[PDB]
Amino acid sequence: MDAAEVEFLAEKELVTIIPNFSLDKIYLIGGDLGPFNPGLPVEVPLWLAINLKQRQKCRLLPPEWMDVEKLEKMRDHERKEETFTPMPSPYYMELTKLLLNHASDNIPKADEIRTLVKDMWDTRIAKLRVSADSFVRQQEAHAKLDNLTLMEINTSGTFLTQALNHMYKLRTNLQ
Amino acid sequence: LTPAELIERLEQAWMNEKFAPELLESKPEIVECVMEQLEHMEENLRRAKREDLKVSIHQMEMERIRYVLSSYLRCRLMKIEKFFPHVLEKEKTRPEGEPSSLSPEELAFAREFMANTESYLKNVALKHMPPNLQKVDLFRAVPKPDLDSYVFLRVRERQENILVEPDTDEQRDYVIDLEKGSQHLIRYKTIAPLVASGAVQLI
Amino acid sequence: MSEAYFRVESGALGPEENFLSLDDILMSHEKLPVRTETAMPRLGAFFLERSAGAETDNAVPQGSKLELPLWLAKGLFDNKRRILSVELPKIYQEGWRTVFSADPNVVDLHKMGPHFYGFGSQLLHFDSPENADISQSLLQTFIGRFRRIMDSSQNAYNEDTSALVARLDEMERGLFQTGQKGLNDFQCWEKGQAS
Amino acid sequence: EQADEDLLSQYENGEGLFSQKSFLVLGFSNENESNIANIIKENAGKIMSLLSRTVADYAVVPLLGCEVEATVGEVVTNTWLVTCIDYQTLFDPKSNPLFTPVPVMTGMTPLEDCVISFSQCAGAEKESLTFLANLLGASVQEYFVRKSNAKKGMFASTHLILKERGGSKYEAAKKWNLPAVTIAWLLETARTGKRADESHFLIENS
Amino acid sequence: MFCEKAMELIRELHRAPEGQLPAFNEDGLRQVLEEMKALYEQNQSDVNEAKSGGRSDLIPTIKFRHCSLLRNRRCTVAYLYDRLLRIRALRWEYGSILPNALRFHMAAEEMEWFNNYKRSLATYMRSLGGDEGLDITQDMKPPKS
C-alpha cells in the first residue's frame, strides 16, 4: 500500500459545500446525498466537493476545525505531550492538502494552515521515531498506538515490520 | 446486509489482504455481491452529458469501487503466485469443514502456475543433469510463508486473555487485554484467529 | 502498489538456508579455513599448493589447512566421521566480538563481508560452545545500528549518506532502499506528483 | 548406516464470424483505425473502448507491433486478421510466425545489397514479406532473373525465398546454383540484423 | 575451481539494474552441465573401484564430488528462477507485447513460459465476474485527479 491509496481512502470523509444550483437528491451506493438548493449547506464526500469545485458549480466551505488558532493550539498540545494526542480526524493530512490545493480562494491563511499541518506532521513522525527506538532497544513485543494515523503507519510500516522480522529471527536463532 | 456494509466489508478484506503476511480466507460472497451491484448500476446508466449530472458522479463511484476491487484481487494474485507450492499443499491437506483460502478459479490458477514452472525447470535443465539430480523438491526449495511477521491491527471488538510471549523464556510471558477501538502492533501468528474471525482489523 | 518484481528474500538467518536466494548463494560461496582430519586421495590437482610431492596419488595429507566454501563444509561436516574440523574466522573471535560490543557503528560490514549476518547465522550449524555468544553479538550489533539506519534513511535528502550506505550489508541496503522508497513516495504525493 | 548405503546405491550400475469475440485496435492512423473497425463490424465483431473496464479477447496491432497497454486474450496482427477473413478460419496465432509481431532491429539494412524474389506467396502474406524485404533494404522484383537487364530495369537475383521443394524458381535456382532458402532465414536475419548463414537454413535441410 | 561459471552467472544476473533483462548466457550453462557430467562419471568410476576393489578409503572423497554436484544444481535452478521473476515484472510493466530490445534477451523456453503465464492470467480474469470479466491491471493508481 502506497500513500496514494491512503489519500484515496481519505477522500471518503464528508464535508460541507454551498451549491449554486438545484438538483434532486441522489442515491449513491454509499449513501443518499442532497437535495441541493442554491445557498444551502449540503454534506457530500470530499471527492465530490473537489469534482464540483473544478467544475466551478459550487463553493467549498472549510471545516470548523480548520482554523489557524485551533490548529496552533493542537500543534502546541501535541508538542507538549510525550505521547500521541487524538487527532481531529483520521485523514487530516489529505483533507488539508486537497482543500488548500483546490479551494485556496475559500480558505483564509492557507499558507499558515499548511505550515501548521506540516509542523504537526513533523512532530508526530519524530515522536514515532523515538517510540520505535524505545520499542526496539527494550526488545518489546507489544505497544499501544491508538492515536496514530493510517498515513504514518502506511508510510513506515514495511520498514518497521522488516526490522522486527530481523530482530525476531536473531532473537530465536538459538534452536 | 446493506450496500454500505458490503462496501465496508470489501475495504476491510482489501486492507487485511494488503497487510496480512499470508493468504487469508476467501470472501466469495463479497466479490459476488459487489460485481452484481456494479452490473446493476452500469445497467441503470444512460448516455447524455447535459443535464444528467448524476451519471457523471455514479460512474465516478463505480470507478472508485472497481479500483478497490482490482487492487484487492491483484494483492491476492501476488500472494497466490509467491507461495504457490505451500498454498497447494495446504489446500490438499485442508481438513473438511474449515474455511478455504482459495476459490475454484484460484485453485486452477495455482495448478497451472505450478505445472508451467515445473515444465520449464524440467525442459531447461533437469533433463540435461545427471540421472540422480533430476528431482527437485519444490516444497523445500520454495520459501514458506513467514507467519512470525509483525503487523499492525485495529481492535473492532474487545478481546481478553491474550498471551504475549516476548521470547523463548516462558518466565517473560504475560497476559494482556485488547480494548475496543485500540490500535496495536504484534506478531501475526499471535492474533491470527482474531483476524480470521473478523474481530480485529489490520491497520 | 509496489513494483511487480521482488527479490527472493534471504533465509540465511533462519534454521536453514533459503534454497533460491541469490544473497544466500553468494554468502555460501565465501571461503572459510578448515583442517583435514583424514587424507583425501586424488584432490591434489585442485589444491596444488598442498600436493605432497607427486607419488601419493595427489592425496590431501592429514592436517592440511584449506579454504573451502561454506556450502561444501556444511555438506561434508559430519560429527561422526569427523572428516574436517572448522576454525573460527578472525572477525568472530573474542576480540572482534568485543569491538562490536564496544561500538557497532564504526565497523564497515560490507568491506568485511557482504553477507555478514547471514554468514554468521549459518556458522551456528557447527557444534561450538560459542554459538550463543555469536548470536548475542549479532543481535546487539543489529540493535546498535538500527537507530543510525533510521536517522539516515529519514534524513538522506539533507545529508550526504553515501559513505554510510557504501558500508551497509546487502540486507541492510535493501531495508534502506525500502525506507527511501517510502519517503520518496510520500514526497511525491505531497507535491502532487504521485499520480 | 542407511545414508552411506543409499549413497552407494545412487551410483550402482545396471452464421456469424467474430460474434462472441472482443477486439482492441491500437497504433493505426485514424483512417486505418476506422477501416479496421468497419471490417470488424462487417464480420460481426465488437470494438471495445480505451480504458475499458472489461478485458479483450484480442488486441489487433500492426505487423511490427506497437504499445498495447491493456491485458488481452491473444495479441494478433492485421495480417492475421486478413488471412482469417480470406480463408474464413480463425487460425491459431502460434500456427504461423507472421500472425504475431516480428522483432526487427531498427535502423539495420543488412540486405541492402541483396536482390530477392518470392515464390508460392500470395495476397497479404506476399505483401508483408515484400514490406519486410524493403524495410531491410533489398529490392524485390516480380520476375526471377540471373542476369541484369538494363532495358527492362531488372537486376540479377541474389536469393530465392520459398517454403517447399518444387516449382519453376526453385528448379531455376538449382540449375543456376542459386540459394533457395526458407522464410525462417529471413526472419532470423531480421531478428539479428545480420545476414544469416544460408547453409544453416537451406530448404533442402528443412 | 568447481562452480565458478555458475558463480559468474549469478553475479552477472545480480548486478543487472532493477527490472532490466540481461541476455541469456547459454555458454556458461553448457559449461556447467558438462562439468556436472564429468563429476558424475568420475564419481561413478570411483564408486565402482571402491566396491570392486575394496578401496573404501576413497568413499569420503567421492562425497566431496557429490556435494559439488548439488551446488551446481542449486545454482542453475536459482539462476533460472530469478529470470522468471523479471519476466513476470515485464508482463505487468509493458503489457502484452514487450519492447523488441527486451525480447531479444529471452530464450525460447522463456518465451513459452511467458505465453503460458499470460494465457493462464487471461483465463483467470475471464473467469471472474460472470460473463463480462474484470481487468484488474487497469487504474493501477487511484483515479484521483
Author numbering:
A (entry chain B): 1 to 175
B (entry chain D): 21 to 223
C (entry chain C): 1 to 195
D (entry chain E): 484 to 497, 550 to 741
E (entry chain A): 1 to 145
Question: What does the literature reporting this entry say, word for word?
Answer:
Activation of the replicative Mcm2-7 helicase by loading GINS and Cdc45 is crucial for replication origin firing, and as such for faithful genetic inheritance.
The resultant map showed a volume of extra density that allowed a short helical element to be incorporated into our model, consistent with the AlphaFold2-Multimer predictions. In addition, the side chain of Tyr494 in the GINI region is inserted into a small pocket on the surface of Psf1 formed by Tyr40, Asn43 and Leu69 with the hydroxyl group picking up a hydrogen bond with the side chain of His66. Together, TopBP1-BRCT4 binds to the A domain of Psf1 and involves the linker region located towards the B domain. This region diverts from the canonical BRCT fold in that it lacks an alpha helix (α2)44 as if to create space for GINS binding. Consistent with published Y2H experiments, our structural data indicate that the GINI core helix region interacts with both Psf1 and Psf3, at a position close to the distal end of the Psf1 A domain, whereas BRCT4 interacts with both the base of the Psf1-A domain and the linker that connects it to the B domain.
